[PDB]
Design a protein around this ligand. Structure first.
Ligand code: SF4
Ligand code: SF4
Ligand code: SF4
Ligand code: SF4
Ligand code: FES
Ligand SMILES: [Ca+2]
Ligand SMILES: [Ca+2]
Ligand code: NA
Ligand SMILES: [Zn+2]
Lengths: 59, 191, 666, 62, 410, 103, 216, 108
């Protein structure tokens, strides 16, 4: 199954809430992108976050 | 009203010592536990006594407690519009024990005792018209006992063969689901 | 035995001074919240949820899990020491710790399998505040790769280290640890390797949150939907106490339940995860072989065909590993009533008949805990009874010495390798033992692998001789749940399997799937799963599995235990006693009972101790006399731990576990 | 598109204030109950291929 | 109190009256009968259309609500209250909430208290409009119900705008009310209150001084104070006889103390007095609705639920804070535990005193839930009330008692 | 029919002990459940299994079954005995420990 | 106690509204004192709408069941009726007021002797109480126009239905688990053909159970 | 569904647990991609009391009661809604449902 949505990020920790205004999404969760695979998927909405390795900024 | 209800409970305990087993005031309500043999005399005293003028019978019901030697409680709720107070009377009844009827005191007790008889199977002595009031004609069992199933045992259907509405054993397309949510943690009672 | 009085809140209670305050509180029926403490694990003291107030001590709250009663300073004049679990200090301490536990915890309850039976949810409801003050980003954690049994969501981990302490202390492996430091410290396996242990499924129960969850069970149910049945496991002869969780017609998972004398509160991975094989490869219709092919038949037709095959013939009855005692008793009554032979030792074990002290022994499982010397003879307890092996390890942790006769294997504890062959056994029995050694508690454990050869009776004779010399208990470790029960009803013939099959023309195979019946006789197979036994059969009568009927199973220590029905057999499967009762009518030998209760009345008349459920009978010591041993080395009974019975061999998960184990060994 | 306006839920008609639509939305259908397009459960005898149900796999003889 | 053997002013005794009564004129009055409310089977013994015996057979709508309640949580049981005296559902919800709140010792927010008074009085008008105008239809007036039920339609829209349901709101919750009212809804309730007295005048003009209406109600179903005490009368059934008893005053609950309203009472205790009392009560309820809307506007913004350990959090908090998500998860599955105890919580429902006798045992489900319906006690007295009247008076007597069988049968 | 009288065991998934105080009399399912062809729901004709009674002591449950002519089996509970550690928390650092404690 | 008022109330509210129209039955039930035909300890509850327990496994049927049972038998002035399991004889006394004569069969010598005493004390003379097993009936005085069985059965033995005249009627309460069906039988061409009458429940009579053994 | 087209329901079963009428039946497994999703989601519309508790309990706004009320059927089984029927309703009524959620969000 292909992801419903891909976002490219420059951080190894992302937050997802369904992108919906003022309580219309899902509970807000923080996800960790593994340094091995470089992507993580939201357990609520299945959105995939993919790391931009060259610009990935460690915090 | 808490001091008032405790004072009233002493008045009842004093004047009807042998009727009253104990009294309690909890959540702003006075409950009187009475003996089965003295309940009619006590309720009559409560109705007529000047200090406690409980001339409105709010209702009579029963509670099932299968873990107890006397499994049933019969509960009388009385209101006084003149004194502006309420009282609850509780008597413990064993299965197959007879409860004296209150219809001599309150004519309106008649239907409440039929309902207790129908839904719990408790018989009342001195009742003029004691028959089932809420269940179907010829119903088997007493549904508000804790050991009677929620869905009962039989269901009706119209039969084209008999041209009648007939009873049949219960068959559920989806069986009743009884979720158990209760947590294994009671919590604390902080002082 | 010098009990000490202590006042908890408003309860004065007398306790062993070695108890911790948390144990004393439970004895007084006072609830104390906890995450890191577990009764059977080493005290950790890291969650800080159990803090109580010691009246008169320093203002610091004390961790009740780590403070022994004797540590409390005595009250003035000798009044009992007081501790409060209800004071404002405790209320504030619990609210503070709960807040700290939740600031980084993910908002996962809807997608988390723990939801509904979560200690974090439940104690947060009872002991925390109802709102949040945390406004910062939360921690996010990467997940682990622990294998096909444990799914990980490590952002949920609350760092209680129960998993580390169980895998290290009880399971006896050293794969898990807590790396790093501070809020970035991670629970992990070394090199992110899958855990290698047949006890690993227990960390799913132990983990208080949904950090470690069951992969096979994931997403399939919520705790409130499940019907719970307290039953007995048959995947091995230990007879572990289990809880079977069903939803409608299907078992959804299997959980341990406590039995201090058998399995404590653990089960092995085979016991835990075989439910996926429960609904596969099922015999749900009768079959009859016609022109070399098995074709569906109705119950009346198959019973008639079986009755025709049996009437007037020489019948042998085989009783398999998973058969309950009533079915074995019924088969003995039926086949012997027709002048036939019934054997239960289908694995070749030379267990003496009628000598309960020789095929069961004299030691309880609970005796291993206190034993200071343990001798293993031709038994790998890690593969035959992993929970019982974990109990040996517990004794070894307290200092017990372990000796082994057999091939050197990894048992998770050290041992003395006395040798590998029957000469090594000979040396032990003939050795002299000091009066000091003979007075210490000890136990001798014998596996089925040792006694499965021609000299099996002699091997037992030396084991009893060694047990008698050392003044030690004896335990015969069985592999089959149904063996000791079958022996108790005397389902045996002189000469064993080969003496029951010699000359037979019909064999009634009641669930024996680990030995082949050679071509020739007419074979009727009664069973629940299609395996070796059904492939050979000329008539198949489908029976119920162990979760689908009530059954009596006698475990390896001789304790009779009742399995309870949790669900019903698929299709036309029938209870095993019922099939034999129905067949008896077609054979003109109707049995003297119409119900399982009637069968059980006759059974406890023949074997009275089967009426005493959950009690270990005392066996009269009757040592064996013939001592002629063989020369060969000992072989262990079990070759593949995960594929020992047809229900396990119908489980896709057990096949994966078996494949993984081979890939590790190679 | 018009249901909200016609039932006074929204003040303004979709001509003036059109509703936002997602690309995965599907066109409106009226009630189909008396027709062949009516919804029916998968196991319905109307379906003419009712879905067969089971919860265990049966052993098959060789 | 037995008129089956006719007594004549000339003392005559008929030969047939001497024989034992074996062949009597018995008729099923209901269940399928326009005056029987669909589920009343009243067996009437008539003698020249004089009612000599009335034998109500009930239970034709008994659905085992009290049994069904024992296997549900406290929140799952709240909609069952809607369906007892279903003409005014939120008034019945109120007794359930009050009983739980008393046992748990919970205080509800001020705004929730005002809303409960507001919609309780809407329910009283919803009931009295139904009672008075269908009572008129029982004595042959076709038009009054049409006028009255148009006003009911408007009030049912106020129901829907508060909770999304016209009848079975499930709006009062243990701990307050589920949602806050939109400001434009308060404007519309105020606008409706300004018109409503005009409809009451129109109904009064059509009925009150009509000679036919008076001859169908005056001196019919006379109740004395002593009769009221025989049969457990409450509500208008006692006030029509001149007893100024109203639970909102005698045993105040919510915030009724600070509202201004009066208690109408009758002097003759007949069907005409109880009709006038109900018309007057409708005017008083409209005034209360006006005061409540003014108080709600003057209130500071606040919550409508107690939150805490009793009610779920707000959805925005549930999706942001870990504590809120847990409390949402737990309170929508297990629900709150109610401490062991027994209470009887009563309200002045539109049809009389409605009460819940709740036995809690410390768990998340009621041990016993006994529902005290005023109509159960009122209907039981129909035999005494109807004895001696003519058959044409029976529908008027059924109307004056204000019976709905969702609560009689439960 | 046959009823089960037993003390429900602690749920292994949780450490609380509040659901382990009571005895229950249960009517176990009497006949197989079926799959509804239309929707796949679990069908049953066994309403007696809806009944689950709760008692405080084994005697109360056994009495009720006797007064009501019910054949019953009493399954005895397996209480977990306290694991009293002689040295308590200090055993983690005993000089004779086989291996270091892991914390 | 005013048992007359209770008796009239029982007929008005438990018999008349339950499709009992036969006035002979209503007249009989208005006159036969129910309390005189119950054990002394049950006298105050003689008119309750439930089965009265007489002996272990035996009851005096509820007034609705008996009223409807007699109404559908449609007894005539010239009928000879067999009342199986008469208990203390209440049902026999009621039927005696309609039929020509009643043969009341009781199996408990204690109840059979009490039935004779109580039947005589009410001056009932067309009722003979015959002591013996219920499932046998009384074949000495057969054939009967009507047979009433006063307790639940699972099967009616052929020996009992052979004592029925051609064109005779038999009414029995059948028990199928928790379900009770009163059926009315008609003897035609030697076979009794049963039909549904109404639903009611009572405990099973001793000797009328069905043969139930092992079933796979 | 979410704006990204994925189903909102994650098979938490809070709606099935709160339902006073037991009108909801759910079965779930891990999807092929490992996602937590239902395989059965039935609502018996002849058991449902239209109370709206399910949409209150849902943590992700997956199940809602929509604006449509004109769906009377000629056969009873047309009111046994399965998952695809319910999802089809959501795909046809999403635009109005989404607007209603925005209008009532300040009060929820
Ligand atoms: S572990 Fe417990 S609190 Fe944490 S997400 Fe899972 S259910 Fe919720
Ligand atoms: S994974 Fe579970 S058991 Fe292990 S430390 Fe974390 S919370 Fe504790
Ligand atoms: S609206 Fe219907 S499906 Fe939803 S919770 Fe209420 S009864 Fe259940
Ligand atoms: S619809 Fe909502 S509440 Fe119901 S299972 Fe799906 S996510 Fe959970
Ligand atoms: S339980 Fe004591 S600190 Fe964790
Ligand atoms: Ca995906
Ligand atoms: Ca007259
Ligand atoms: Na866990
Ligand atoms: Zn997301």
């Amino acid at each position: 199954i292909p992801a419903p949505e891909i976002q490219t990020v420059t951080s190894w920790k992302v937050a997802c809430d369904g992108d919906e205004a003022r309580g219309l999404g899902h509970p807000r969760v923080w996800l960790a992108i593994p340094r091995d695979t470089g992507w993580v998927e939201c357990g609520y909405c299945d959105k995939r976050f993919v790391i931009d390795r060259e610009h990935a900024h460690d915090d | 009203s808490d001091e008032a209800l405790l004072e009233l409970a002493e008045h009842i305990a004093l004047r009807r010592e042998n009727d009253v087993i104990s009294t309690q005031v909890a959540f702003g309500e006075l409950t009187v536990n009475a003996t089965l043999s003295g309940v009619i005399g006590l309720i009559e005293f409560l109705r007529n006594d000047p200090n406690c003028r409980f001339s409105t019978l709010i209702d009579i019901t029963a509670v099932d407690n299968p873990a107890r030697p006397a499994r049933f409680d019969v509960v009388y709720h009385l209101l006084s519009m003149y004194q502006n107070q309420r009282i609850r009377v509780k008597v413990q009844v064993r299965e197959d024990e007879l409860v004296p009827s209150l219809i001599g005191v309150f004519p309106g007790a008649n239907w409440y005792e039929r309902e207790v008889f129908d839904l719990f199977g408790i018989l009342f002595s001195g009742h003029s018209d004691l028959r089932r009031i809420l269940t179907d004609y010829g119903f088997r069992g007493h549904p508000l006992r804790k050991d009677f199933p929620t869905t009962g045992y039989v269901e009706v259907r119209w039969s084209d063969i008999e041209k009648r509405v007939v009873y049949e054993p219960v068959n559920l397309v989806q069986e009743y689901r009884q979720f158990d949510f209760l947590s294994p943690w009671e919590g604390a009672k902080y002082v | 035995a010098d009990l000490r009085k202590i006042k908890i809140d408003d309860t004065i209670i007398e306790v062993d001074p070695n108890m911790t305050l948390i144990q004393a509180c439970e004895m007084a029926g006072i609830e104390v919240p906890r995450f890191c403490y577990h009764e059977r694990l080493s005290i950790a003291g890291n969650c800080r949820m159990c803090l109580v107030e010691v009246v008169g001590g320093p203002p610091k709250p004390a961790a009740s899990c780590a403070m022994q009663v004797k540590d409390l300073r005595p009250g003035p004049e000798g009044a009992p020491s007081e501790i409060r679990t209800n004071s404002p200090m405790v209320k504030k301490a619990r609210e503070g710790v709960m807040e700290f536990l939740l600031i980084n915890h993910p908002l996962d309850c809807p997608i988390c399998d723990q939801g509904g039976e979560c200690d974090l949810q439940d104690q947060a409801m009872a002991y925390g505040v109802d709102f949040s003050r945390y406004r910062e980003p939360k921690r996010a954690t990467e997940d682990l790769n622990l294998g096909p049994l444990v799914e990980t969501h490590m952002t949920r981990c609350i760092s209680c280290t129960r998993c580390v302490r169980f895998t290290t202390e009880v399971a006896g492996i050293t794969q898990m640890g807590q790396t790093g430091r501070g809020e970035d410290s991670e629970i992990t396996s070394y090199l992110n390797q899958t855990l290698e242990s047949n006890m690993q499924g227990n960390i799913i129960d132990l983990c208080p949150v949904g950090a470690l969850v069951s992969k096979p069970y994931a997403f399939t149910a919520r705790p409130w939907e499940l019907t719970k049945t307290e039953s007995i496991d048959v995947m091995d002869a230990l007879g572990s106490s289990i809880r079977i969780d069903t939803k409608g017609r299907e078992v959804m998972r299997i959980l341990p339940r406590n039995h201090d004398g058998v399995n404590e509160e653990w089960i092995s991975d085979k016991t835990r995860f075989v439910w996926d094989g429960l609904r596969r490869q099922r015999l749900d219709r009768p079959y009859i072989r016609e022109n070399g092919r098995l074709r569906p038949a109705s119950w009346p037709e198959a019973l008639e065909a079986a009755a025709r095959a049996m009437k007037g013939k020489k019948i042998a009855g085989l009783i398999g590993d998973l058969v309950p005692a009533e079915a074995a008793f019924s088969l003995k009554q039926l086949v012997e009533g027709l002048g036939g032979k019934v054997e239960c030792r289908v694995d070749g074990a030379r267990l003496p008949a009628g000598n309960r002290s020789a095929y069961v022994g004299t030691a309880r499982i609970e005796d291993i805990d206190d034993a200071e010397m343990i001798q293993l003879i031709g038994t790998n307890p890690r593969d035959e009874a992993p929970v019982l092996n974990a109990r040996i390890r517990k004794a070894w942790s307290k200092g017990a010495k372990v000796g082994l006769v057999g091939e050197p294997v990894d048992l998770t504890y050290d041992y003395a390798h006395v040798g590998t062959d029957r000469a090594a056994l000979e040396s032990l029995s003939s050795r002299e033992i000091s009066d000091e050694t003979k007075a210490r508690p000890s136990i001798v454990i014998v596996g089925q692998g040792a006694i499965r050869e021609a000299d099996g009776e002699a091997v037992l004779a030396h084991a009893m001789k060694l047990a008698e010399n050392s003044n030690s208990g004896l335990l015969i470790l069985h592999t089959a749940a149904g063996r000791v029960g079958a022996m108790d009803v005397g389902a045996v013939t002189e000469g064993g399997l080969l003496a029951a099959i010699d000359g037979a023309e019909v064999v009634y195979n009641l669930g024996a799937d680990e030995v082949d019946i050679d071509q020739g006789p007419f074979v009727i197979y009664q069973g629940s799963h299609g395996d070796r036994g059904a492939h050979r059969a000329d008539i198949i009568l489908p029976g119920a599995c162990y979760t689908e009927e009530s059954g009596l199973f006698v475990n390896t220590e001789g304790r009779p235990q009742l399995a309870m029905r949790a669900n019903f057999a698929p299709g036309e499967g029938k209870e095993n006693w019922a099939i034999l009762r129905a067949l008896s009518a077609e054979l003109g030998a109707t049995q003297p009972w119409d119900s399982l209760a009637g069968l059980r009345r006759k059974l406890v008349e023949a074997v009275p101790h089967l009426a005493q459920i959950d009690q270990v009978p005392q066996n009269e010591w009757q040592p064996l006399g013939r001592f002629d041993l063989g020369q060969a080395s000992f072989r262990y009974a079990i070759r593949d731990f995960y594929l020992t019975n047809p229900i396990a061999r119908s489980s896709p998960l057990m096949g994966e576990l078996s494949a993984m184990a081979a890939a590790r060994k190679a | 598109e018009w249901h909200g306006w016609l039932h006074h839920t929204y003040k303004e008609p979709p001509t003036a204030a059109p509703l936002a639509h997602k690309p995965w939305e599907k066109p409106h259908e009226p009630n189909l109950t008396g027709s062949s397009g009516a919804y029916h459960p998968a196991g319905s005898l109307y379906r003419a291929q009712p879905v067969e149900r089971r919860d265990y796999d049966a052993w098959q003889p060789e | 109190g037995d008129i089956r053997k006719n007594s004549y002013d000339d003392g005559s005794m008929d030969a047939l009256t001497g024989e034992q009564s074996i062949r009597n004129f018995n008729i099923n009055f209901g269940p399928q009968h326009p005056a029987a409310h669909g589920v009343l089977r009243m067996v009437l013994e008539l003698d020249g259309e004089i009612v000599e015996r009335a034998d109500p057979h009930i239970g034709l709508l008994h659905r085992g609500t009290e049994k069904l309640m024992e296997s549900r949580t406290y929140l799952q049981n709240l909609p069952y209250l809607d369906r007892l005296d279903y003409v005014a559902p939120m008034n019945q919800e109120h007794a359930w909430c009050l009983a739980i709140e008393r046992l748990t010792g919970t205080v509800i927010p001020r705004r929730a208290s005002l809303i409960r008074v507001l919609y309780s009085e809407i329910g009283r008008i919803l009931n009295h409009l139904m009672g008075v105008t269908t009572g008129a239809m029982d004595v042959g007036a076709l038009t009054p119900p049409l006028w009255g039920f148009e006003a009911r339609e408007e009030l049912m829209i106020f129901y829907e705008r508060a909770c999304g349901a016209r009848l079975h709101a499930a709006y009062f919750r243990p701990g307050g009310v589920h949602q806050d009212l939109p400001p434009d809804l308060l404007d519309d309730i105020e606008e409706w209150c300004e018109r409503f007295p005009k409809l009451v005048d129109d109904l009064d003009t059509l009925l009150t001084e009509n000679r036919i209406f008076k001859q169908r109600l005056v001196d019919i179903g006379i109740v004395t104070e002593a009769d009221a005490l025989d049969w457990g009368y409450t509500g208008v059934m006692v006030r029509g006889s001149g007893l100024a008893w109203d639970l909102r005053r005698s045993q105040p609950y919510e915030c009724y103390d600070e509202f201004d309203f009066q208690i109408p009472v009758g002097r003759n205790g007949d069907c005409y007095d109880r009709y006038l009392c109900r018309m007057a009560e409708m005017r008083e309820s409209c005034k209360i609705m006006q005061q409540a809307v003014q108080k709600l506007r003057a209130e500071p913004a606040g919550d409508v639920l107690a939150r805490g350990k009793l009610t779920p959090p707000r959805r925005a908090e549930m999706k942001r804070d870990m504590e809120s998500l847990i409390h949402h998860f737990k309170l929508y599955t297990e629900g709150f535990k109610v401490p062991a105890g027994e209470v009887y919580a009563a309200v002045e429902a539109p049809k009389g005193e409605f009460g819940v006798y709740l036995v809690a045992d410390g768990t998340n489900k009621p041990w016993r839930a006994k529902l005290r319906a005023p109509g159960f006690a009122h209907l039981q007295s129909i035999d005494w009330m109807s004895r001696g009247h003519m058959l044409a008076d029976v529908p008027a007597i059924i109307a004056t008692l204000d019976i709905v069988f969702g609560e009689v049968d439960r | 029919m046959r009823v089960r009288i037993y003390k429900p065991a602690r749920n292994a998934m949780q450490s609380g002990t509040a659901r382990t105080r009571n005895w229950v009399l249960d009517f176990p399912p009497a006949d197989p459940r079926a799959i509804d062809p239309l929707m796949g729901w679990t069908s049953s004709d066994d309403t007696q299994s809806q009944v689950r009674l709760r008692f405080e002591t084994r005697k109360q449950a056994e009495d009720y079954a006797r007064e009501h002519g019910l054949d019953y089996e009493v399954i005895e509970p397996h209480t977990r005995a306290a694991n009293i550690r002689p040295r308590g928390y200090g055993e983690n650092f005993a000089s004779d420990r086989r291996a270091p404690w892991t914390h | 106690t005013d048992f007359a008022q209770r008796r009239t109330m029982m007929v008005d509210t438990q018999v008349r509204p339950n499709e009992v129209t036969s006035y002979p039955v209503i007249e009989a039930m208005l006159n036969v004192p129910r309390e005189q035909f119950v054990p002394e300890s049950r006298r105050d509850v003689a008119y309750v709408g439930n089965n009265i327990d007489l002996a272990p496994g035996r009851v005096l049927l509820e007034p609705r069941t008996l009223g409807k049972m007699m109404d559908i038998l449609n007894l005539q002035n010239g009928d000879l009726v067999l009342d199986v399991g008469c208990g203390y004889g209440y049902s026999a006394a009621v039927m005696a007021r309609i039929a020509e004569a009643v043969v009341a069969v009781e199996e408990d010598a204690a109840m059979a002797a009490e039935a004779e005493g109580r039947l005589a004390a009410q001056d009932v003379f067309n009722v003979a109480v015959v002591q013996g097993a219920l499932a046998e009936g009384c074949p000495g005085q057969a054939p009967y126009d009507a047979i009433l069985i006063e307790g639940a059965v699972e099967q009616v033995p052929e020996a009992l239905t052979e004592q029925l005249r051609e064109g005779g009627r038999i009414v029995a309460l059948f028990r199928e688990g928790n379900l009770g069906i009163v059926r009315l039988g008609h003897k035609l061409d030697g076979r009794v053909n049963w039909r549904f009458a109404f639903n009611a429940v009572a405990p099973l009579l001793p000797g009328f159970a069905r043969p139930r053994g092992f079933v796979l | 569904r979410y704006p990204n087209g994925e189903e909102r329901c994650i098979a938490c079963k809070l709606c099935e647990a709160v339902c006073p009428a037991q009108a909801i039946t759910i079965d779930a497994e891990p999807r092929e991609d490992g996602s937590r999703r239902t395989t059965r989601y039935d609502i018996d519309m002849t058991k449902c009391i239209y109370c709206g508790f399910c949409q209150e309990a849902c943590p992700v706004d997956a199940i809602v009661e929509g604006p449509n009320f004109e769906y009377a059927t000629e056969t009873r089984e047309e009111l046994f809604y399965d998952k695809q029927k319910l999802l089809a309703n959501g795909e046809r009524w999403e635009a109005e449902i989404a607007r209603n959620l925005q209008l009532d969000a300040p009060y929820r």
